[PDB]
Ligand binder design. Structure first.
Ligand SMILES: [Mg+2]
Ligand SMILES: [Mg+2]
Ligand SMILES: [Mg+2]
Ligand SMILES: [Zn+2]
Lengths: 68, 241, 57, 120, 50
RNA sequence: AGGGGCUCUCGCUUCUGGCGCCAAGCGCCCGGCCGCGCGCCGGCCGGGCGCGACCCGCUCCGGGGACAGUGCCAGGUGGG
């Protein structure tokens, strides 16, 4: 049931918990460099429903795009 | 008594413009690498900002002596490793070969790890106790778990150490661990620890749920405002009376 | 001479038998000697002037 | 106490760098030295200027490979002609091969060396 | 060059390692070679000091 | 007239075109040598620690600062 709880929590993006987490993680991704390798998926339920499996040979890269 | 007259105390003074500075400790003023600056400023940020109660509850961890007592209890019921497991399988195979037969022989109680597993256990009221690590670094895999264990009425505790959980379950890290039913000689150890944990966590959940966190200023800022408050009080106490 | 011929010369041809010899002139050597001496003497007399004017409250 | 940072600069701490112990050589055998002595010396030169150099300066003159240097030419001559070499002056011709004059040690004689070679 | 306002090459003593450090102060009028200049909050109000 | 509470004081460089780093000293230990040979015990060769160089602390220090700035839209201006 755990992934269902994470899924509902990540749909509640304007809650105070999620807006705190999003702001602090946005701050630290801003402090990192533009193309970066993550050591693990930040959103594991989203990653697995998009195809990721916790095996050797699946890697995760964080990319920053200048928006507009 | 026979000391040499050629030896002499020759001190050096380290005033400004005088003899050059000694290699004193510089560890506060180091140009640190950016990952060190990032983790230090992340810790500072958490303390500075207003942290919601669903994360403050994970800040409120357990007392050390009860934590060690719980670990002793968990070490009594830790899962088995691969080598002792295969020894158990070969022993089962040889006793099945000769000669008493199927013999399930009362499959022992064991700890149950993993957030999906314990979410099912809490949801169907199977667990006697839930223990959750305080430093899950993506802290949103567990922020629903205290409310869930509260509503189901299962006692849960926030332990201080994810690696400590992982080491008792023979891996690197582990998020949560559930206690199911236990043998008779440790039922009394439970029958003290469970109401200790329940009085620490479940009975004061509303206070926990409304108690906010963070929002403390830096040492320089609190020193400056304390200077201003005492610099007003030191003459207001003389104006009064 | 040129610097690389200075490499293959000898130590006597490149310096003078004096302290700071072959880098400074004799006149400024003498002036720095007596300047060091006189400034240390002035520091001694200021220290003993304070040490005798420890005779107050 | 008692570990102290006496410098305001963090430097990358030096670590262990292992040598290679490969599981297999990337190629099978060492490559053949295709510049051996017979490849170094191609043929002698037998022009009139060559004969003048032979009878006057106790020196032979060969057309040699473009890749060969004076050390390789001297070693190749001393090996496959079994003589001693005083010095070697080389040029590259406007056709593109290396002409090498090799002056022998004085106890040897360019006349009888050229007689043993057969350019005489 | 391209400036004319003279520069003062001034040598200070480094306080943390055995070395002398040179600066390139803008020369205030009246200063001369071989004089001392002083820099800090407790320097005296003379011409050329900082 | 001993002082503490109360401030400036826990500040050591200004007549001179010099020098200045890679610690002196003190205190406590550890080892070998002969050896008083009775033990903090005699001395000879070494080695270490601490104070000298105060202790804690969560942003390197200072200046700004929820503005600036940037993204998107809107109005004006725009023979560049
Ligand atoms: Mg000379
Ligand atoms: Mg040439
Ligand atoms: Mg037009
Ligand atoms: Zn001079």
């Amino acid at each position: 049931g755990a992934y269902k709880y994470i899924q509902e929590l990540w749909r509640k993006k304007q809650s105070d918990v999620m807006r705190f987490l999003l702001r602090v993680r946005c701050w630290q991704y801003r402090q990192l460099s533009a193309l970066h390798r993550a050591p693990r998926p930040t959103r594991p339920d989203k990653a697995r429903r998009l195809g990721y499996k916790a095996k050797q040979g699946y890697v995760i890269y964080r990319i920053r795009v200048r928006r507009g | 008594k026979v000391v040499n007259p050629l030896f002499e105390k020759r001190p050096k003074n380290f005033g400004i413009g005088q003899d050059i500075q000694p290699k004193r400790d510089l560890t506060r003023f180091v140009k640190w690498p950016r990952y060190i600056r990032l983790q230090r400023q992340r810790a500072i940020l958490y303390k500075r900002l207003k942290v919601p109660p669903a994360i403050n509850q994970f800040t409120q961890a357990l007392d050390r002596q009860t934590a060690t007592q719980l670990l002793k209890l968990a070490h009594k019921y830790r899962p088995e490793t691969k080598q002792e497991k295969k020894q158990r399988l070969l022993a089962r195979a040889e006793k099945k070969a000769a000669g008493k037969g199927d013999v399930p022989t009362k499959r022992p109680p064991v700890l149950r790890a993993g957030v999906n597993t314990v979410t099912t256990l809490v949801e169907n009221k199977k667990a006697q106790l839930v223990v959750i690590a305080h430093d899950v670094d993506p802290i949103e895999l567990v922020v629903f778990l205290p409310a869930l264990c509260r509503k189901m009425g299962v006692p849960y505790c926030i332990i201080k150490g994810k690696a400590r959980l992982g080491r008792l379950v023979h891996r690197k890290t582990c998020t949560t661990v559930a206690f199911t039913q236990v043998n008779s000689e440790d039922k009394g150890a439970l029958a003290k620890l469970v109401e200790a944990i329940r009085t620490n966590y479940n009975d004061r959940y509303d206070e926990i749920r409304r108690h906010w966190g963070g929002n403390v200023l830096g040492p320089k800022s609190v020193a400056r405002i304390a200077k201003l408050e005492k610099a007003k009080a030191k003459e207001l106490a003389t104006k009064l009376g | 001479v040129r610097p690389k011929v200075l490499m293959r010369l000898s130590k006597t041809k490149k310096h003078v038998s004096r302290a700071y010899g072959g880098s400074m002139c004799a006149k400024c050597v003498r002036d720095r000697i007596k300047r060091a001496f006189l400034i240390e003497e002035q520091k001694i007399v200021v220290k003993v002037l304070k040490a005798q004017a420890q005779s107050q409250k | 106490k008692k570990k102290i940072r006496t410098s305001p600069t963090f430097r990358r701490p030096k670590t262990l760098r292992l040598r290679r112990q490969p599981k297999y050589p990337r190629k099978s055998a060492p490559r053949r030295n295709k510049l051996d002595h017979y490849a170094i010396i191609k043929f002698p030169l037998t022009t009139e200027s060559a004969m003048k150099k032979i009878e006057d300066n106790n020196t032979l003159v060969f057309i040699v490979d473009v890749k060969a240097n004076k050390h390789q030419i001297k070693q190749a001559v001393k090996k496959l002609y079994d003589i001693d070499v005083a010095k070697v002056n080389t040029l590259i011709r406007p056709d593109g091969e290396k002409k090498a004059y090799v002056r022998l040690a004085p106890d040897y004689d360019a006349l009888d060396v050229a007689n043993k070679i057969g350019i005489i | 060059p391209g400036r004319g306002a003279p520069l003062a090459k001034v040598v200070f003593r480094d306080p943390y390692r055995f070395k002398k450090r040179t600066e390139l102060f803008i020369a205030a009028e009246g200063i001369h070679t071989g004089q001392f200049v002083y820099c800090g909050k407790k320097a005296q109000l003379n011409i050329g000091n900082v």
